[model samples]
Target chain A: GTILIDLSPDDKEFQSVEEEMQSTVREHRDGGHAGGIFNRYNILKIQKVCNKKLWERYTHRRKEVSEENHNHANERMLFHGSPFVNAIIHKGFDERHAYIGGMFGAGIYFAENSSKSNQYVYGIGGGTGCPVHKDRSCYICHRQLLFCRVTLGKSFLQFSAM
Target chain B: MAHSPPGHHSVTGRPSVNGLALAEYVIYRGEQAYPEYLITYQIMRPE
Candidate 1:
């Protein structure tokens, strides 16, 4: 109810750290807000920063998260890297090196040309840590079967299939 | 779109490396003008 998010403070890094906190909150907080850290992750969203391409255009499902559109921080839903889908540095910040494990990183629209992989955002094949849903808005497993694919990998060979 | 990193003093497109292919690369090896003198350049591969 009273999360203190100081904006435009004396510290310069406050702006960046706070911005990250806001981005995380805006992208992850699902169903409701609680005082805990979310960490289950499986999929990542890639943003196009480089001109080279080995793929095509795609879109994320909007995360089933709608913006409350509140200017206040506490009232807004917060998101972070969870055991399900992960949180990534907003593309363009990094110098273009798409590592698949860190999914759920990109945003609404990309405006960078750092690497070739940034062209698409991967979804569906997300990973979940808890045996069940992390939030009220999570998808239920009828038979607990999810068909996954490879976008980013530790090494190209570690995944003939992940 | 812009090549300027924050706090960068001067940007020059002169002095190519391998001392060749001046048109292909946009190298900036700041020496006399660039106080700190840092070399920032990228290879131009055909797309």
Candidate 2:
């Protein structure tokens, strides 16, 4: 079977726009709308959620193993990483939209502030999966993983996955 | 609730040194305060 992946330019584009916005903000720091610039440049922030439902669902299922072993497997699965607080993207001058980004499998470790022991989450313009690496491990998980991709345009933002 | 030994819960709400939350739990054993527990919970990305 053939798999297709979409690598959008949103993140790079956003960074470029953000740098421009920062420069604009600096130039207009004294202007009445200086705060607006700050707001505009703040593309996204992480929001925390406990998601008890997910926890319950996780605990409810077992992989034909003892609780200790199941817990160990569960721990392994979750240890890969958690969800990020939703990322907020600006839509036009006053509107905004939030996107929920979660890390799974192995890429969670590569996230900022993450370590081999504790998984971490972050926001980016695109999907999540194995990062581009030549290592053998990368191919196994990321080869066909599906992820939600967030996009922003002149009027609105949206998300999709394969 | 479980408990982690001393020095295990250092970076609460942040990733642990091992790059996986499960590994952190093994290393820390959930022996710290609620905040540490909360951090572990936060790092759990459900499969």
Candidate 3:
């Protein structure tokens, strides 16, 4: 018997947003996010590994070109891009306190091809909103602050887990 | 493997192999009045 295993893009499960974010944080805490805490070289290594993984798992998926398949902006986004949407990372005030001090945001990459130029695109234009400040601070006595500014391009798609 | 099970046939006299079984799940939050995100996935198998 020829045991044919049909492993389509549909076969792979879409990870939950909360779960994925938590996993990313865990990786960072364990010295995986962009590199280990001890050295800048470790951070670069981590980034390289993550980028490769993202390209392998996501960039290879077959993309549908129809407008119906795109977001309201007609952007060509993918499942991997979902992790970058509304992503907020709160950095701690000091070494002792692991709690977040301020938030940083980022956008995902959508490539035209495997080339580096086709990589690292952001902000499709329009419908960009500013993050508002909240009244109460959870732990620290710090004011609300926005860290990074990113623009997402049209090639990225976003989805949410129910 | 050559014989068919008793009383198993389609509209025609052809022997019927087991049909495919499909399981589907849909996850959604909130009411239809203001629906939130929804995702559906399915698994199919030959019985």
Candidate 4:
């Protein structure tokens, strides 16, 4: 039906929530991992109606998350003490970060920052941590930076700094 | 608006993780500033 004022993404309230969400996006420290969808859809196609200032700040946090996560992965690859630590490193992070829709993704839709033209790819970001584990949990949730590539019979020994 | 404690609210513009569009957050009885209260940080199953 026709509407007078729909609660669209361009609305003030939507902007407020988005701003707040961005601020708290990095609060998932249950082992530096979390899961959720990044809202990247613009139904009305009018999101310029609000504010993305803090939202911009949120984007930077993602870079460090992946870079930091990448380092974590590499440390274990060097054989820290036990594969147990790599187990945590290879534990599998499912943050599912994105925006409009991948809103929860660390760099889901746009790698690191939306700083490039036609440079949005799924695992490869400008920073590091080429791939971020998706947040498909609770049929159970296993948190880690990157899930092992081996679909069958894999080990945490693969956690590397590269 | 009518719900019980220790309850979860999944849909209502919820988000999907790992391409597995499941529940967004687990509901419980607690603070308004914390978990369990009509959470808005979610993703609806995108087309």
Candidate 5:
């Protein structure tokens, strides 16, 4: 359903993404509470053939929105971080399955800043249901992050708490 | 009409904080987004 390609350092696409994430975190930090700089070891280009048709179908809607609004198709590259890396890579995003509370109503969440997204990244266990550490927190050496292409058509902006 | 406004496809909001940490965008339909890249990274700690 999906093919994960390991992008090399020499690859322009790899360099482009690596720099984007790197600079994004650096510039987007919040005091000492920032997520800090992430030294990217690898970038896996996600080619989900099964999901492509549906995403493209959404693109058609993007075009329609663009035409009516007289603006460029509202496509944006955004970051979504979670512990369910394997689940998301395979099953795709389902709001119903999300355990997090909807701060702005139930929907799939995306972050403009990678730093904010990194807060959601979690540790993985050594085995099923078992805790790797005595305190129940696994040693998270490597973290997985998802960079997505989002079609944000006519966006509704909210500034205050509901 | 139900999830969001009739014409809107997504929502952008500031739940907390300011700067880049402030903004988040959400869409009711999953098809509106695609996982384009999976990044594996390690953080660098300063002395």
Candidate 6:
């Protein structure tokens, strides 16, 4: 379980997230590119309620990775689209929940472009109209995604499938 | 988790498909990542 920190619009982190979403959406949707319509409503900063052991593991890996890379750029904040965001918070990022046929490989997939991540979201079923734009009717009207911090140690670079 | 593709911690790539250009990143271990923020959003209007 995790504590969901409801971010205020005035919060710096909130503004950054909103800006990232808007900027990426515009970049992806411009130049005759057809599909960027998901408008964000709000964001929750995840704070662990328990899972101290898992936290230890993640931190340990982070230390190990930072030492290896000898720089801070190896770590990145990325987007992971999933319907099971709650499950992930409770259990951590288990590949057991990962789906089949990820173009990269059999691993937990993430994206720098939020729009690309949006494409993979298996949105929650039956929710009220978007809190941002209240005019739309409720019918799977909301989708969720995880903005994750990933330790990308020594990555394999690829232009296509690795 | 079982066998990593020798000498790589994760994978990063740019692949375009279905009008989407993905700057994808993949990591093998669950411990290598943590969910920091959860976003709730929806398609405001069909394009």
TM-score of chain B of each: 0.19, 0.17, 0.18, 0.18, 0.66, 0.66
Which has the better lDDT: candidate 1, or candidate 3?
A: 1
Better-scoring candidate (lDDT), 1 or 5: 5
Evaluate every candidate with DockQ and list the scores.
0.01, 0.04, 0.01, 0.03, 0.51, 0.51
lDDT score for candidate 4 against the true structure: 0.22
User: How far is A70's C-alpha from truth in model 5 (Å)?
Assistant: 5.1
Model 3 stretches with alpha carbons more than 4 Å out? A1-49, A62-73, A76-136, A139-162, B1-47
lDDT of 3 by residue, A118-141 (tens): 011121210121123221111111
For model 2, the stretches where C-alpha displacement exceeds 4 angstroms are: A1-48, A62-71, A74-84, A87-162, B1-47
lDDT of 5 at A2: 62
What TM-score, to 2 decimals, does candidate 5 have?
A: 0.73
Count of clashing residue pairs in every prediction: 29, 17, 14, 31, 0, 0
DockQ of predicted model 5: 0.51
Which scores higher on DockQ, 2 or 5?
5
DockQ of 4: 0.03
lDDT by residue (tens digit), candidate 3, B1-47? 11112221101111123122111111010010010111111111113
**Accuracy of chain B in candidate 5 (TM-score):** 0.66
lDDT of 5 by residue, B1-47 (tens): 12766678788887554433447888887667777788876555543
| Candidate 5 segments whose C-alpha is farther than 4 A from its true place | A26-51, A57-72, A97-100, A123-140, A160-162, B15-17, B20-22
User: Which digits, one per residue and each the tens of the lDDT, describe model 2 over residues A1-162?
Assistant: 111222233656435433432332221212312111112222231212233433333334322222424233222212222233222110110111111232211111211112221212221322342245322222122111101111101111112120
Error of 4 at B31 (Å): 12
Best by TM-score: 6
Per-model TM-score, in order, reads: 0.16, 0.19, 0.15, 0.20, 0.73, 0.75
Model 1: share of real contacts kept: 0.00
Per-residue lDDT, model 1, residue A81, is 20
